[PDB]
Design a protein around this ligand. Structure first.
Ligand SMILES: [Br-]
Ligand SMILES: [Br-]
Ligand SMILES: [Br-]
Ligand SMILES: [Br-]
Ligand SMILES: [Br-]
Ligand SMILES: [Br-]
Ligand SMILES: [Br-]
Ligand SMILES: [Br-]
Ligand SMILES: [Br-]
Ligand SMILES: [Br-]
Ligand SMILES: [Br-]
Ligand SMILES: [Br-]
Ligand SMILES: [Br-]
Ligand SMILES: [Br-]
Ligand SMILES: [Br-]
Ligand SMILES: [Br-]
Ligand SMILES: [Br-]
Ligand SMILES: [Br-]
Ligand SMILES: [Br-]
Ligand SMILES: [Br-]
Ligand SMILES: [Br-]
Ligand SMILES: [Br-]
Ligand SMILES: [Br-]
Ligand SMILES: [Br-]
Ligand SMILES: [Br-]
Ligand SMILES: [Br-]
Ligand SMILES: [Br-]
Ligand SMILES: [Br-]
Ligand SMILES: [Br-]
Ligand SMILES: [Br-]
Ligand SMILES: [Mg+2]
Ligand SMILES: [Mg+2]
Ligand SMILES: [Mg+2]
Ligand SMILES: [Mg+2]
Lengths: 209, 209, 209, 209
C-alpha cells in the first residue's frame, strides 16, 4: 500500500445506500401505537461488554476462542464483569423512549446461561428501567432446554428487535418483527464488524456509542 | 472561526438520518411492475446546467436574479446553451434502467417556456433515449396557459418523480407518486443547496455527478 | 456488487492520511513574507471549464480525445467558451488573499496556445484581479516555441503553485516551489479524478467548488 | 431539531483542515534516525481504560468526579482494573514500529500515583515490549515530589510524545518535542472529546481503535 495514497472528492462524499434512522424518527413511526413488547440484544447493542470478553479471553484462552465454551468464563462474565461494561448512549435513548411509551422491555442474549446472573440487574440499574417495564434477561440458543432467539421473539410477541449482529436482524425478520440495526464500536474486540444495513433494514445513526 | 478547529471521531463518523438508496435498489423495488410513466426534473437532476445559468446571470443581470424573468435569456438557455450542460451519471443510470423496463420517460421543468426549445433533443441525444420511450419536455408552472408540475404528474400518471429541489419531492407527494431525491452538485450556481431527505424521502447515493 | 452492501463505523470514520489546510492557514503561514509571485493552473483549479471541454468533445470528436489536438477547438475554447466556465470559490478566496498581500498573480496553463485568447480577461474580470497584480495567462508545454510549466515557474520566481493535477504539484516540486493541491470536482468531465495528496503535499479542504 | 434534517453534498464531503498522518508516514519521517526516546500518554492513547474509570465512578462517586481524588479508587485502577482495559491497535502499531527502530519506550501518565502499580506490567505484556525497550510508567503531575509531564519529557530526552489530550500536545510543544495526536474513542467515558488537530499538530488516521 502506497505511502501517500491521496483521495478525491468522489470518495470523500461517497455514501453506502443505508436506510439510516434517528431515535426521534423511530418514536415518530410508533406514535399513537399502544404499549407493546420490544427487545434488545445485549452485547454491542446496549453494553460495550468487550472489557469482560477481553479479560475472559486473556485469562482462559489467549490462543483460541475456547473461553466462550468454558463455564468458568461465563460464571464471571454473567455475575459481575458487566460492572466494567460501558452502557451505550443510543440504548439509553431508546430505552427511555420505550419506557416513555409504556412498552415492555426484553433483553435477549446469546450468552451461555449460568446458575445465577446479575446482568438483568446491571441493565435495570444502568438504564433506569422501572420494574414494571423490565423483564429478566432471556438466554436464548440451541442447547437442550433453550428456545432460540426467534422462538423467544414469537413467544413474547416482541414487535421490534434492536441489535448489532446479522443474526439479530434475521431473527426479527423470521417472525415478522421489525429488526433495527445498531452499529458495533470499532474498538469492540468482536471482529470483523458486521455490515450494518446488509438486509436493507433500518440502521440507527451514530449508534456506536 | 479558529485557525486550527481540530476534530473528533464522533464528528468524523456522524451520519444524518437519510434514507439512501442505489439505482439497483430502486430497480429491484420495481421488479415485475409492468411499464409505467416516470418523470425527471432537468436542472441539477439530469443536467448540470449551471454553465448557461451562470452565463445568463453575468450577461443579463450581473447584479440581480432578473435574468430569470428575461425572455431573451430563456430563448438562449433553451435553444443551445444546454450544449454546455453536463449530463449527470446518476441520470444515465436511471434513464437506461427505465428504458430497460420499457417505461415512458417524462421531463417536467420549471424553466420559462419559449417559442422553440432544443432541450428535448439534447436530452434524447445525450441519454440515448429511444423515441418510443421519450416525450417532449413539459414546461410547467403557474403562468396562464400552464399547468403546475403536480397537475402534469397527475395528468401523465407519472409514478416516480426524480428531482433535486424540495418542490420536486412535494410535487410528487401531492399526487401520491414516489418522490426520489438527487443531490445538487456543490459547484452548482443555484444556492443554497437543498436539504436532500428533508421529507423522509429516498435519496440516491453519490448522485451529485 | 451486493444489493445491500451495508457499512460499519471503522469505514464511516476512516480518513486517508492527507495534509489538509485552509486558506486561513496558508495566509497565516505567509504572515510577514513581503510581496512574491504565485501561480495557478486554470482548469479545475480556478475554473470549472468542463462545459467547454464537453461541448468541444461532442462537436469535434464524439468518439475520441482528438478534439484536444484540434486547433479549431482551442480557438473556440480560449476565445469565449470560458463564459460558461464556473469560477471556483476556493480560487476567489485564494486570489483575494494573494491580492491583499500584494502578490503578483500568474496563471500557467497546459491548454494549446491560439492567435488570441480572452481567458486572461475572463479571469481578471471574474476574480476582480487589479491589473497591477494580474498577468496574462502563460500557455506552457513541450511544443517548439514553448517553455515547460516548470521553466515558467523558475522564470517568474513563482513560490506557490496551486493546481488539481499531479503535474501541477510535481512541476512545483521540480523548482523548489510550494505545490498546493485543489480537489477536482466529481462532475468534471476530466477523469479519473486525481489522487489529491499523492505526494504528501498540502490539499485545500472543500476545494471542489 | 427537525425530524428530517436532510443533508447536502457540501456537508457530505466537508473536511476539517487536519494534518492527518499514517504510522508508515511517521516511520518514514524517522528513517535513518538512530535509536531515540519516545513517549505515550496511557489513557485513550494506548489503553481504552474507560471500563475501570466507569466502574470507579459508579462505585465511589456516582454523582461527582470525586472518585478521581480518592486513593482507594486509584489503588484499584492501578493494580488490576487495567485487565479490562482494551489495547488500541494504533498503539500496537506504533509500539512495534518504535521497537523495530530500537527506540526507548516511555509511558507518562497523569494518573495519581499509588504504593504499587501493575500498569507497567500490563503494558509490557499486552504490547510485547522487550524489557530492554521498556521503562516503568512515569506518574507525572504537580503534587509535591512529582515532576510535571514536560519536566519528564525534558528529563528523559523524549523526542516524540503521543497522546489524545490537549495537555499531551502542549507538554510536547513546551520542551520542543514532536506532539502527535491520537483520537479518543467516542465510547470513552471521558468527555467532551478533545479537538484533535487544535494546535496544528499531526493527528494519526483511524486512531480511535
Ligand atoms: Br489458549
Ligand atoms: Br478455555
Ligand atoms: Br466480578
Ligand atoms: Br444519552
Ligand atoms: Br437458558
Ligand atoms: Br438462537
Ligand atoms: Br454479524
Ligand atoms: Br472490521
Ligand atoms: Br431493494
Ligand atoms: Br444587473
Ligand atoms: Br435581465
Ligand atoms: Br454512467
Ligand atoms: Br409548478
Ligand atoms: Br429546494
Ligand atoms: Br449551501
Ligand atoms: Br497555520
Ligand atoms: Br469522433
Ligand atoms: Br477533432
Ligand atoms: Br467565495
Ligand atoms: Br509543461
Ligand atoms: Br493527475
Ligand atoms: Br474517478
Ligand atoms: Br457521589
Ligand atoms: Br469519592
Ligand atoms: Br483487580
Ligand atoms: Br494491530
Ligand atoms: Br509519583
Ligand atoms: Br503534569
Ligand atoms: Br483535551
Ligand atoms: Br464529545
Ligand atoms: Mg450483539
Ligand atoms: Mg432541479
Ligand atoms: Mg487543472
Ligand atoms: Mg489520555
Amino acid at each position: 500500500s502506497p505511502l501517500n495514497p491521496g483521495t478525491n472528492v468522489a470518495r470523500l462524499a461517497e455514501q453506502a445506500p443505508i436506510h439510516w434512522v434517528s431515535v426521534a424518527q423511530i418514536e415518530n413511526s410508533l406514535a399513537g401505537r399502544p404499549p407493546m413488547a420490544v427487545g434488545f440484544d445485549i452485547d454491542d447493542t446496549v453494553l460495550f461488554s468487550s472489557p469482560g470478553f477481553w479479560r475472559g479471553k486473556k485469562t482462559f484462552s489467549p490462543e483460541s476462542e475456547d473461553y466462550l465454551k468454558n463455564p468458568v468464563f461465563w460464571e464471571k462474565m454473567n455475575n459481575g464483569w458487566d460492572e466494567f461494561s460501558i452502557p451505550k448512549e443510543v440504548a439509553r435513548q431508546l430505552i427511555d423512549m420505550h419506557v416513555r411509551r409504556g412498552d415492555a422491555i426484553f433483553f435477549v442474549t446469546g450468552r451461555s446461561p449460568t446458575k445465577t446472573e446479575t446482568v438483568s440487574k446491571t441493565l435495570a440499574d444502568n438504564f433506569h428501567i422501572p420494574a414494571t417495564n423490565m423483564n429478566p434477561v432471556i438466554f436464548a440458543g440451541d442447547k437442550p432446554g433453550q428456545n432460540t432467539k426467534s422462538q423467544w421473539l414469537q413467544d413474547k410477541n416482541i414487535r421490534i428487535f434492536y441489535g448489532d449482529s446479522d443474526n439479530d436482524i434475521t431473527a426479527a425478520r423470521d417472525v415478522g418483527a421489525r429488526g433495527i440495526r445498531i452499529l458495533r464500536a470499532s474498538n469492540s474486540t468482536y471482529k470483523p464488524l458486521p455490515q450494518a444495513g446488509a438486509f436493507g433494514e433500518e440502521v440507527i445513526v451514530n449508534s456506536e456509542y
